[PDB]
Amino acid sequence: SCLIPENLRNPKKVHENRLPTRAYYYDQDIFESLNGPWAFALFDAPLDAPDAKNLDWETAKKWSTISVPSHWELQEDWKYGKPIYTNVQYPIPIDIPNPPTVNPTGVYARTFELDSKSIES
Amino acid sequence: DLNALSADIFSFMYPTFEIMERWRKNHTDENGKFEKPLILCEYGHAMGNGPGSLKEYQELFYKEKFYQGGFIWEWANHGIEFEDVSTADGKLHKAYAYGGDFKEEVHDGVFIMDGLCNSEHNPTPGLVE
Amino acid sequence: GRGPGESYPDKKESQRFGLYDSKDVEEFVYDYPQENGNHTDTHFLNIKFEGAGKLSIFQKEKPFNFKISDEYGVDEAAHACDVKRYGRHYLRLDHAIHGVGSEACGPAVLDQYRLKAQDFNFEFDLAFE
Amino acid sequence: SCLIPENLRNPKKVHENRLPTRAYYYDQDIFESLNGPWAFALFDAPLDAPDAKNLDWETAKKWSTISVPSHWELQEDWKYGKPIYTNVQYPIPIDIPNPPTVNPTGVYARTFELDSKSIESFEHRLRFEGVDNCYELYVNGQYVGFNKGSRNGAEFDIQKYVSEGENLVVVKVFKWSDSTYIEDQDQWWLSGIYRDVSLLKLPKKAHIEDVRVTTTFVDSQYQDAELSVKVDVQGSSYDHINFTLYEPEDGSKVYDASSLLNEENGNTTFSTKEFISFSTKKNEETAFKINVKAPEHWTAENPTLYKYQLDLIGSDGSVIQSIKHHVGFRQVELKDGNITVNGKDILFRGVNRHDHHPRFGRAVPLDFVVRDLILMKKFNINAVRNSHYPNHPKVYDLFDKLGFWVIDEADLETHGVQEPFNRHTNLEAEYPDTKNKLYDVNAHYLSDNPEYEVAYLDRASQLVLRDVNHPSIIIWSLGNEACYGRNHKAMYKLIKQLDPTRLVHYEGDLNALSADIFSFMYPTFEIMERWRKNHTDENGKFEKPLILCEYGHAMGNGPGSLKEYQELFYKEKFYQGGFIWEWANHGIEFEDVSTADGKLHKAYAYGGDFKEEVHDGVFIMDGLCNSEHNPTPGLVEYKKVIEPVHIKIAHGSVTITNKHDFITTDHLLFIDKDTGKTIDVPSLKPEESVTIPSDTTYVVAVLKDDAGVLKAGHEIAWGQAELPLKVPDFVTETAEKAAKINDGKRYVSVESSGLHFILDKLLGKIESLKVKGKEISSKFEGSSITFWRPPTNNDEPRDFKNWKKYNIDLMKQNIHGVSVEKGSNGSLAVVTVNSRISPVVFYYGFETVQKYTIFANKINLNTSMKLTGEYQPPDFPRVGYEFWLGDSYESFEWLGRGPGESYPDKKESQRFGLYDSKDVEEFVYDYPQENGNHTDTHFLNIKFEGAGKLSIFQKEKPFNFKISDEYGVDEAAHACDVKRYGRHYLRLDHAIHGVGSEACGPAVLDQYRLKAQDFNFEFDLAFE
Amino acid sequence: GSKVYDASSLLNEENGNTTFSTKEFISFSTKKNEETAFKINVKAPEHWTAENPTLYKYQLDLIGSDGSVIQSIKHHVGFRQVELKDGNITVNGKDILFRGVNRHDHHPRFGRAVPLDFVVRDLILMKKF
Ligand SMILES: [Mn+3]
Ligand SMILES: [Mn+3]
């Protein structure tokens, strides 16, 4: 299935490059929040989303913003859809391990500042 | 994992007293020893007016060392706030959505509203009981 | 009788006995409209009329059930705001009421709480001050 | 008075050992929160409270806890009393400067841990953001100091008193003091530590104490500017200071609550887009002046900010302390008689905002304040007045970042000195041009009292010095309604010495002898105009301008005539706008017993609900937003009248005028609503306009992109061509149908295929009208034409008194003759009713003729009402029919104004269109009153289940209507007290009285009053 | 565990210069080039239990050659042992009883993006019931 990206239909692709899980401790001096407004665009499926290896901030600047954290089905005026409730039944067809081809894809973008000393320290 | 082949505990959801009692008896040996206990990971479904007979479950919990209690389902209704058109009024009002209100192709309706607390996470008579 | 909140055969024990005034109670609004507001094990009920005192109501030899409300269209109202209201209140004065159980997901109302089909015999007094 | 402690009755004891006020900067590394649960006990008076010099933690441990911050009148189960509402009147006896002897005293206690290294490394302070009314402070059983000024901050040096290990903080808080006399704001009386408490750890050997930042343009063309940064460094062990200004972030920057409130952090790199850098030299002044090439201006319409970092640096070249804040390049002047920012004479589109939350009171979560301001921006507001005190210090960065013109106001109100005078002299009215002579009588008690000078100066000093560095603040105000005296003059001198960069406001000073601005509250247009003319010389020059610090009182249904105030604002350069009173209702959430139900319901309290001895009732509920801080129709209307772009559509032309002070229209997308295609609008500068030929009826001005706290597509302005009244194309059945007419002794029947008309001739009542499955009948009590409405808050002081006096609520219809004839021109029958409609007790009334022309599918109702008799009312609330709707009734739809309610002087925000009742959440007033009317209604369709619609239209003029459920509105204290019928009614009205702002301000204007006169109007009841 | 908390003190996240505690009980140091781990015997510590959540605060410091603090972890220890013992779920030797609920992440407006403030609200209510 070349119309569905490989990593969305691979049960073994649990992550790529994720660090090993460790015990959680919040530390104010270490943790710096990136919550707030991010540039955001929603696409019908992966193939309509831009290549992120070529996405400028100059391009993403022009998008609407969404606030992180939040679900995109819970926005002012249901801008990016509405919530779906199912109990037992899957809301997709069962074709393990394929997801549906039309697969809502949201691209988030924001920037942050880094010091000369920061990268060194 | 009914027989806890790879668990340390037995667990039922929404069991009948008779079913609890069958299990107890089939897992207590002649000496009165049991190898693993029973919890109710989900019981006393709290949907709407109810749950009834929390009393009878409790009496059972206190009577047998083999039972170690339960966790009622659920803490709070999953209602989402939205604008509803009133069937009484013909006008727009704040309400709490369950399946169908967002016009899903497939949904499970009012099973969203199964908490001891309402959608605003405030106590119902269920929690009080 | 039992209060301050509602009570049902298998959902009543949290509601201790005492003298209760409707003015002190915020009656519970269900997120999904359904049977509500019953008071079980009622010894007597006083209904206050402006400028004319009270009407006392009691059932002979057994406590009774009652509901005083405003509401209708409850069966088909999808949300609290869909509930219709009359221009006057009614009294629902009941000899008996079915239990509540947890059958939406779990056991049916237990036998001793079911309002089984049978003969009914009961006596009420409507005592006017 | 030895039964009252000396410090609670000494106007000069403003504080003991409080540090000098400095510019506020929050720093996460320095600030350590002491918020949370504290040991707390309440005592009847000071003499019952323990001696804090002997209070153990072992003893205080045993008390109940209260959470800081919070008011003690707002606890679970009203444990420590209930809120008290007074407007003008003091809730205490006036015996200046004594407070009452019985003076609620709350003792707070908690502990905190201190390290060995901590005491060595840092200077330790306690900072209290706000405590009401005043307090003495103890650490480890030792007196630290005393403080007055409830909405001001305070820092105390704690170094001498602290130990390694556990440290005990004890705060003794008093409800009343000599300070109470100057804290008489029209608001809730609430006590306690209601704002943050912090432990500050400053670097010990040297630290930054204070910073002053000013931006002065060098030139009359406002290009190059001088940035002046002066630093006060405390201690010897430092080398110099560094300063970095970063490249600007445009005011169009996108924010949300999370990013606005983010407080991080130590290792967080503030910015790296360097613009200017400066270093000081060893042993030289820790201050400097920099020339800045053509910087981006800070404006409320475009709050462009330059971030900066100020570093204190030691001998080893390491950073001792950093301040990360911002600079807004802005200059305020009094120039050619106008308040001027960067050379431009600005317009205030403002509100007064108190600190209020429906559950927490004046202890407002910052989250909630952000909510307020986002809403303000969403509704075209550009300015706020801090009525009547400074807010939490963190709020001012919010103004800086979002862009508001801010009047920061001293915590000083004296109003209550007038109340005994008002009652003794039976004073009926105060007017902005003359009322100062009344206040002059009592100024000697406080504002002209030398004993209070120190206190008055303290309120000024505290106000200015805490907030000096916020570009959003352009005006300092000396307080509110405190009369006028020497103390105000003293405050003015001090503020100008402290901060020459801003202007001074004080409304109590009519002639602005010690203010830079003129200010009125609730003035009449005539009064505004008298003032303008008396202060403009023969050349057209004025020395100072006029603002309305309070106007358009937003209490309940209203305010009316915002339109007429605005027209005035735009017409004269001398007027620079106003701030409406108020932002939001001050309602406190509580459990109410229902008058409708007999049951308990959530409601919002105003005066009386908490059973005060003395209170001022419903004057709590005077906001554009309700108690839950959500928009009312007031806010909706205000947004429209103040829209910063005018769109006028006439004669095949759209004229667009830019009404901003600074920004262009470039950020706006103009949509032709009739076609959906956008309109190419040239970039318009302030006051520039353009006419574009178009066939359009309806043009909208909308935001192109997310900017600030607003979303793409957000409506800023709009315009419509006026809509002619068109008769619907309903076909009346004029074919000849056989019809049975039964004219009985009392009742008259007209029956035909699909039609049933019964009238009670004795009453003039329609018993039943059923046409094609659709039924109505008259909602009858005395009369078939009624005049009453549940009085608005504005109606109460005068119009209601008149309407009650003339028994308008008891209008009766007395039938004189009924005429029944067979149908003529396609007609089935004509029933004509002659009657007198007059109230009991009275002569005046209407000689009335009601002609019912009955067709098979339509009923024409002609009403002729001739005003007759002596001793008439001036005006009526309303005039029209009331009809019960059949059981079939489900919904309605109308052509006219919407989606919300509308009234003669409160309607323009409600554009024309086709509206469906199903799409509208009808507004619930916190205080039940006249609501739900729709004015300028072209036609109304009432939908009946399974039987289609009934169409209703008035001939030759648009009409008024209300469809509802409700009654007992007059006497319902709260929303939950409103009663409801088992069926809906239609209130179908020829005309309705305007709304005005008379609860505090001008009566409904003449052109909006429903004057007593003859009424003649024709309605059609067309059945599908 | 009888310690008094509120939303503010439960959620307080501060801070760098804040002195965690100073009521020292036990101290341990590791030696250069040795395992960065250890086992300590603790004399009759206070038990952590759900009915009494007694906690020992601790501070763990990473230390450089110059003896300065590279990084700190400030957390707590709850002295508690869970076992399967004679067929029962056992904490500190005691066969416990679950008085429980299932709690999903839910907020009526934000969904699964629940403010911590709101979670605290949930748990206070649970304890109150
Ligand atoms: Mn509904
Ligand atoms: Mn009430």
Swiss-Prot record, chain C:
Signal peptide: none annotated. Belongs to the glycosyl hydrolase 2 family. This is Beta-galactosidase. It comes from Kluyveromyces lactis (strain ATCC 8585 / CBS 2359 / DSM 70799 / NBRC 1267 / NRRL Y-1140 / WM37). The chain holds residues 897 to 1025 of 1025 of the full protein.
From Swiss-Prot, chain E:
Signal peptide: none annotated. It comes from the Eukaryota. Belongs to the glycosyl hydrolase 2 family. This is Beta-galactosidase. The chain holds residues 252 to 380 of 1025 of the full protein.
